[PDB]
Structure formats: structure tokens, C-alpha cells
Amino acid sequence: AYKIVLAGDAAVGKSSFLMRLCKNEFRFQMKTLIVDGERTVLQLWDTAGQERFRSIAKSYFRKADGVLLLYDVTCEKSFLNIREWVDMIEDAAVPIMLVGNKADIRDTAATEGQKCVPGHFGEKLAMTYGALFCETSAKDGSNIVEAVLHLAREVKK
Amino acid sequence: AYKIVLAGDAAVGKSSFLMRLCKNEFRGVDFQMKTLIVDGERTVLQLWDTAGQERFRSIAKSYFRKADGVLLLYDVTCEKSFLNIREWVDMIEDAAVPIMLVGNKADIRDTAATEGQKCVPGHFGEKLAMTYGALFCETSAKDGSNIVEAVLHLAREVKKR
Numbered sequence: 167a168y169k170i171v172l173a174g175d176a177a178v179g180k181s182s183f184l185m186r187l188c189k190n191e192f193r194f195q196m197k198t199l200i201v202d203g204e205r206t207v208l209q210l211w212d213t214a215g216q217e218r219f220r221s222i223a224k225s226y227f228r229k230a231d232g233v234l235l236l237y238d239v240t241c242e243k244s245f246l247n248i249r250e251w252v253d254m255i256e257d258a259a260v261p262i263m264l265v266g267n268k269a270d271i272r273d274t275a276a277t278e279g280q281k282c283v284p285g286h287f288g289e290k291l292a293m294t295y296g297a298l299f300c301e302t303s304a305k306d307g308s309n310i311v312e313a314v315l316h317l318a319r320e321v322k323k
Numbered sequence: 324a325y326k327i328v329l330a331g332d333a334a335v336g337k338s339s340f341l342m343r344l345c346k347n348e349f350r351g352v353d354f355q356m357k358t359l360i361v362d363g364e365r366t367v368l369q370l371w372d373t374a375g376q377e378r379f380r381s382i383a384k385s386y387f388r389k390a391d392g393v394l395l396l397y398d399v400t401c402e403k404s405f406l407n408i409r410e411w412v413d414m415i416e417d418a419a420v421p422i423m424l425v426g427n428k429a430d431i432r433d434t435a436a437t438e439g440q441k442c443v444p445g446h447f448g449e450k451l452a453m454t455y456g457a458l459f460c461e462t463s464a465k466d467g468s469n470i471v472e473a474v475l476h477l478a479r480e481v482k483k484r
């Protein structure tokens with residue numbers, strides 16, 4: 167099994183991402199992917215409930231084969247804090263997949279004149295880090311399985 | 324595209340350097356594509372900086388490993404930023420690459436010296452660059468002095484590897 171860690175600030179949607187991926191619903195865990203030819207099993211750890219414990223995050227990053235690092239496209243601070251998480255991963259570690267989650271609210275946010283992190287900011291930040299990038303919605307399921315497959319393919323190298 | 328990172332202490336003028344270079348103006352991650360003519364040929368640069376991330380040593384190192392070259396800035400009117408050049412060079416040499424040492428804000432040297440404030444003379448900048456085998460240049464993001472020239476000098480050394 168490949169050990170995959172979900173990290174990012176509280177309230178970015180880590181628990182929701184896992185439930186959508188594993189149980190297909192919105193309100194460690196095991197996940198079998200078919201990646202290219204092969205059956206590929208993931209063991210999925212998350213830092214939800216424990217985000218403030220740097221030592222726990224760091225320990226997870228040490229045992230990780232790969233990291234899914236979420237921010238929330240509607241929460242600017244969660245995107246600013248990506249630097250805090252990546253520094254911890256670079257020190258303790260591994261493929262990183264940067265995920266702009268909650269992409270489904272962007273239209274609502276935009277309509278009501280509220281600020282969202284544009285996707286190209288995430289693409290560019292991810293590029294500087296040598297990280298993959300993906301926008302997802304744990305709510306409507308969009309890109310959820312695809313983000314994890316893109317990470318798994320990079321881990322299998 | 325050659326990958327070029329700007330580094331150095333906060334407030335040395337990394338953003339201002341990039342904005343002057345890429346947009347010819349002075350007023351997420353700073354990230355710009357820039358085409359230069361180096362000798363005969365078109366040469367594409369992928370440029371970013373460590374503004375907002377200076378205190379993250381693991382990220383800095385990751386950036387220095389990924390760079391084809393570094394523009395490393397200090398502020399000629401701020402001695403501490405110059406002394407810290409030695410910390411930055413250690414990280415760059417530990418990580419990996421051509422370095423261009425840039426003494427930025429050269430336009431303020433007269434204002435500093437008029438007001439009794441200490442500045443780093445270019446001779447000291449050149450001497451530190453020679454210690455490390457780095458290129459050296461003084462620049463001003465504010466008035467545009469030597470900004471493109473610095474980058475071209477680095478790009479030539481990067482193409483030579």
C-alpha cells in the first residue's frame with residue numbers, strides 16, 4: 167500500500183475529500199485505484215482535527231509516499247498558508263499534489279463580488295514547488311478521483 | 324525556458340526587480356515569463372522569487388535545486404541584508420548553479436550618504452562576489468539602472484552550462 171497524507175488548514179475540505187473519494191458522499195481509510203494496468207491500494211491519512219500539531223503533520227510527512235495538500239479557493243488565508251505546509255513537507259520528506267478545493271463556490275463567490283484564488287495562481291505556485299496541481303469539489307465530486315490518480319501515477323515512479 | 328529565482332532578505336527589492344524587468348514599472352507567488360535576446364538568439368526565462376517565503380529554508384533550498392541560476396539581492400543601503408548574503412550563498416551551494424549578486428537600490432546611496440546612513444560600497448559587493456565566483460552588479464528597480472543588463476549577464480553564464 168501507498169501511504170498518502172491529506173494536509174492543509176482546518177476547514178479546506180480534507181474530511182469531505184476523503185468521504186467523497188472513499189464512500190462517494192458529501193454531508194487511516196483504504197482506497198483501491200486502477201492506475202494504468204494495475205490495482206493500486208492507497209492508505210489515506212489526514213491531519214483533520216490535528217492541524218495545529220506541527221509534530222504530527224511532520225511525522226505523517228515522514229511516512230508519506232505522497233501528499234495531497236488542500237487549500238480552499240474561497241479562503242485566501244488557506245492559500246497563503248500553503249507555504250507553511252510545503253516547508254514542513256520539504257523538510258520531513260515525495261510527490262505533492264496541490265488541490266484548490268471547493269471550486270464549485272467560485273461562481274457563487276464571483277456573483278456576490280467575493281474573492282476567490284484564481285486557478286492559475288495555484289498552477290504557478292505548484293510549478294515553483296515542483297508540485298502537481300488540481301482544482302476539485304468534494305461537494306459535487308469533480309476532479310476528486312482524478313487528483314488522487316494523478317498523484318498515484320507520480321508516486322508509482 | 325531557463326529557470327531563474329530571485330532571492331535575498333525581505334525588503335531588498337525582489338518583487339520590484341521582477342516588476343521593473345517584466346513590466347517596466349515601479350510603484351500569490353511573483354511568477355513571470357520573459358524573453359531576452361542573448362547574443363543572436365531568443366532566450367526564454369521562467370522567473371520567480373522568494374518574497375513572502377524568505378523564512379522557509381526548505382522551500383528556499385527546493386527553489387535553489389530547481390533553478391538554472393539565481394539573482395541574489397541585497398539592498399546597498401542595508402548592511403544586514405549584505406551580511407546575510409553569506410547565509411543565502413551557503414543555502415544555494417548546499418542545494419546545488421550560476422549566481423549573480425545584485426546590490427539593489429543603488430539610486431538611494433546618495434540619500435543615505437547625505438543623511439549620514441551607512442551604505443555598502445560596490446567594491447565590497449564585487450569582492451564578496453569574487454570570493455564565491457559569482458557575477459556582481461549594482462541595480463535600481465526604481466529607475467531601471469542595470470536591471471536588464473544584470474539578467475542578461477546571468478543568462479549568458481546559465482547558457483554556458
Ligand SMILES: Nc1nc2c(ncn2[C@@H]2O[C@H](COP(=O)(O)OP(=O)(O)O)[C@@H](O)[C@H]2O)c(=O)[nH]1
Nearest residue numbers: 176177178179180181182193214268303304305
Ligand atoms: N461547497 C463546498 N463545501 C465544502 C467542500 N469541501 C468541504 N466543504 C465544506 O467545508 C467545511 C469544512 O469541510 P471539512 O471536510 O470538515 O474540512 P477539514 O477541516 O479540512 O477536514 C464543511 O462545512 C464542508 O461541508 C466543497 O468542495 N465544496
Ligand SMILES: Nc1nc2c(ncn2[C@@H]2O[C@H](COP(=O)(O)OP(=O)(O)O)[C@@H](O)[C@H]2O)c(=O)[nH]1
Nearest residue numbers: 333334335336337338339374428431463464465
Ligand atoms: N529606492 C528604491 N526602493 C526600492 C528599490 N527596489 C525596491 N524598493 C522598495 O523597497 C521596498 C521593498 O521592495 P520589495 O520589492 O517589496 O522587496 P522584497 O521584499 O524583496 O520583494 C519597497 O517599498 C520598494 O518600493 C530600488 O531600486 N530603489
